[model samples]
Target: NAITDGRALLRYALPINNKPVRELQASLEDISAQLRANRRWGAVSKDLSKASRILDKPSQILTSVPEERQTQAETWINELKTGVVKVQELAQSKDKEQVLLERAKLLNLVSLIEESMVKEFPFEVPEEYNNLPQLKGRATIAIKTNKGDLTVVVDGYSAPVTAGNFVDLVKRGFYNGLEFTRSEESYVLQTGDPPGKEQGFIDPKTGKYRAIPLEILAEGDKKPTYGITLEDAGRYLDMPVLPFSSFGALAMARPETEVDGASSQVFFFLFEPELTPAGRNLLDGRYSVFGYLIEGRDILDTLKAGDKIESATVVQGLDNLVQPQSAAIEVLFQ
Candidate 1:
């Protein structure tokens, strides 16, 4: 009922052909997509000029919506309009910093609109892309647990955000005193929440929970796309699916509510022949699998609830973490 209502309201209220709005959105995405290309600025400027004309005015669509929904719709439309104005003003600017600021703002506005339409879109606007690291070679994490040291070969090349998130948290000592909160025989072992076993990690600087996007890919087992949900990727149709086929398959723990709600919690499969199939069937695309244990199946066998993660560290390829902003630029260009 809600999805139907939201869809109808958006379709009937927006005065313009939904096509122009969709076109502008696509144009904005192109600007972001080409952000780090060889001729990024020139391309971005052209796209911005085109999008500005399309979004020159605030949507009259809000006027037709019910009073209650209008507030949110109005806020999204006004902010989007404002962002377009900023993009137009900054379109020809050669200042990299200013261009980046406006681009980030525009992207956030786009995210707001996208979320309003989808209702359960998972990715949130990252605060700063520059902070994300670029994953390179030989990335590994040494997770010292009460049982033993579990060394994981992180899939930095394939799962950058998920791996980068783990590496970043480790470097910050986020896992210093946390303990394994969930353990099941021949199933999975879980940890990564900082304040407590069941609690999610809270960023000290922002005083908010820091969540990363779901990053899992089946093609060549490469890195997952950031800022997109399974539904957005056309889950069973075009989306690539990765199976949880072996023990020690590492992945982020997420609530069923939102696909991209993964924050600091993580888990490792303790694969068993009979149970593995069911687990794979259940988790394949739903969870964000980033890596697997390179050398610690024995340690996993010994773990249970309340076992401590003595300390976690990136023993190799620490340099591989993707710096968010730089990665964003590269993503746009690529």
Candidate 2:
């Protein structure tokens, strides 16, 4: 009767032995609270209050303890502080619409930090690291609208196969008439092939409408791959992609909430809004973000909902496309 439950106990029986993993547990609860409340939030909101309380506990624990516990306490304190700084910086922005968004991000960061503190990286390292695929060629374009055109630079150096596939799809006129619809604030603008023509845009004739297998990027040298839950504190750790900036980074879409491992379409988050557990669950490192927009903030800002494909296609360089090639993808907002 060798159960995984028994195996878990034998493994984390040392540093995590009987310690009330309150920090890791509460981090998740705080995230849940924000989602339950939805978009209504303020600067000093209840969700913010709860995150502050949970984050402050490690400091309280370190106030009075034996010298041996100093290192342990320090570790937790540092973890909490890094996340706290990020939250404080976010809050200071005080952008009304963005506060609630940052709240989710605070909780996610707290969850990430606590997990790292509890489960330090195991020393048994890998002999070699596998590189992310870097496909050859570029995303092709077929603009058929009055609005601006698009220019997407596929990353062959980082995610080769996935990038290569996208480029090939474009060259075959697969995306010539496809739509670039749906734009969520701080989330992403979803485009590429339609789920299936009649269902949407990608022509069934193209035969490239089916979802691809999960395109997971290799995690760099990072500790903790997923975050844990209340019941089992050391089991979950998240490993995310790098250059954690928010200037229109492109990534394949995954829909555990909708459909898992579907990659016919791709999207880019227009803003770097906060990422809560609910949001993180949707986001995280599940999708592979290959490239970022280096220009075109004005056009991206002009977009609105229900916007259809005024034109959705890509070019090699900035040559034929509009100025600020990054925002070349356009829509007729009604």
Candidate 3:
């Protein structure tokens, strides 16, 4: 009775819908069809499915869904995010009873929110686009564990030059036995830097092997003001110590001493933090940033230091490609 009373109180407090509620219902139904129709779980499709469902019903409920289902969704999301193969295996077998069960529960909660709000906002329904790029790649490293068994694709287009370099490296066994060497919080677990071993890179002025060039992460693409100079030698000397790019943006690693392609270090943005404070400023035309960790970043976070750079490999899926591998271990913290 209290729940009913609470429900009534909620409904009574809201205004009536100016647009027919059936229109919202119809829109939701269309979205449901798309989710079921989608053969691949992609960024847009996954995000759109969530968005459509959220707006398909009541906004209040949608907003509340996260709070109410946080614990549960987080648990499921963690499981799904733990490893790429784990999810692919679950999806392939169509035996995702647990995943399905959790998704169902979430949908129920979302429906309640979608249905409860007054005067549902009219949002644009996106038209279907043709030939969207699908991310996929293969890992060439051998694995005694389940890390490389499943198919994975790299994000080739977003960072074309970087992706190409990464692909080339993998094919050449450059990353075959490498390790995940560095970890910068809100950033990423970095591997592929052979020179990161103890004693790291020697100073060139001292006539020792140093680091190599990866890519520079330009942040201006996301915002103004704090943009990072990329690949250009001039940008390196003129810019600040670091740039404003946030989590998920990939960059190469080089020690503070050298400015040119002196190190073979690479890094990825794990979390989004104020760039001015991190003080990692040295990243222009320095290390080569060839690719990014597109999917399973949630899993990459759980890695620890001293973890061997397990292996690197690629996969092909539904005509696309993806690559995944283990790095040596984390070298940074949150």
Candidate 4:
């Protein structure tokens, strides 16, 4: 008897067929909120072809499990039955914006397979995709500061690898003399940690200290949508709306218990007159905001904690920076 429920093998029938695959992923987010409030693509493709014929009935109830835990629940129920057959071939196409990006990639593949069945962990995919080098557009960093230079406009399309990893650590002088080591006036000012050094910031071409991976934007959408991964949004607590709510903004300093522990600190959001939504949900989606402070915004209230960074260039798209690669060790379902 499967070792008398020692768990694992479809741990309790994969949460009882993941409750009708979370009611067909909330009926495909209510047919894209009824075609964004009734622009009615044929009345939502007749309920998106009746929710794409029950998208393989919760991976056909994992064929009563036991076939070695049915291969990661039949490979994420065949990727939600190939995204409900591409949502019934985009419900007979005419490209309504590719039917809202295939209905947000079929509701982010049913929240990436119910967040890999609540982290018993299984559905992982990202093999050769993140070719990683966005921000082929806007960029303009400038820091300086003795209480002066600020200028940050980096949005390289929302924030490609956090404005190309802060323009490759400001073209590698690595935030010059780095200082503002954590000021908290109205909350946040931090610098790229490494002045008096504390075992971080070492990467003279990967000599060490490397962390980066939690590109924001996903929960209830906004834009960045960097392949969703803050440990897959802390398994459905699904954060990343990136709101620290104004003031210098720019973020990225991680370690809420490390999942790609960020690297070269970098903060700003000194909310002198805003933030309070419980201080933007105490750093929304747990930090990684990415870019703001378009022109010193009052020198982040004359910064504090040893304010330094005496220089941090990249005053415009340094060739869309993002040169750090060598990732290819994957295959985990344990």
Question: TM-scores of the models, in the given order?
Answer: 0.53, 0.40, 0.36, 0.26
Cα lDDT tens digits for candidate 1, 48-121: 77777666654533333456565786787777777767776766565556766676666556534543442221
Report the number of the highest-lDDT candidate.
Answer: 1
What is the Cα-based TM-score of model 3?
Answer: 0.36
Candidate 3 error regions (>4 Å): 1-158, 182-188, 195-248, 255-264, 272-291, 317-334
RMSD of model 3 against the true structure: 18.6
Question: Please, what are the lDDT tens digits per residue for candidate 2 over residues 1-334?
Answer: 1111111211221122223334444443344344444443452444455555655666444434345556765665566556555555654564444544554454434333333343332222111212211233223333333344433444433343455445545544555545566645445677665545522224343554444333333334322222122113321244333222354556666554432344457776664434423233444355555555534445544444544445445555222111112335676689
CA lDDT of each candidate?
A: 0.61, 0.42, 0.36, 0.59
Candidate 3, position 326, lDDT = 24
lDDT for model 3, please: 0.36
Each prediction's RMSD to truth: 18.9, 16.5, 18.6, 19.0
Give candidate 1's whole-model lDDT.
0.61
Error of 1 at 127 (Å): 11
Ranking by lDDT: 1, 4, 2, 3
**What is candidate 1's CA lDDT for residue 252?**
89
Which prediction has more favorable lDDT, 1 or 3? 1
State how far residue 112 of model 2 sits from its true place (Å): 35
Per-residue lDDT of model 4, residues 1-334, tens digit only: 1111111111222223455655666576667656655476776777666566666465544444455555776676677667667766776764567676777676655544553443221222132324433443446778888888988766544456666767776777878877786534447778787756553556555477766666665444434444344545453455543445556767887777674577678787765432354322456566677666756676777778777878877866687564534555666788
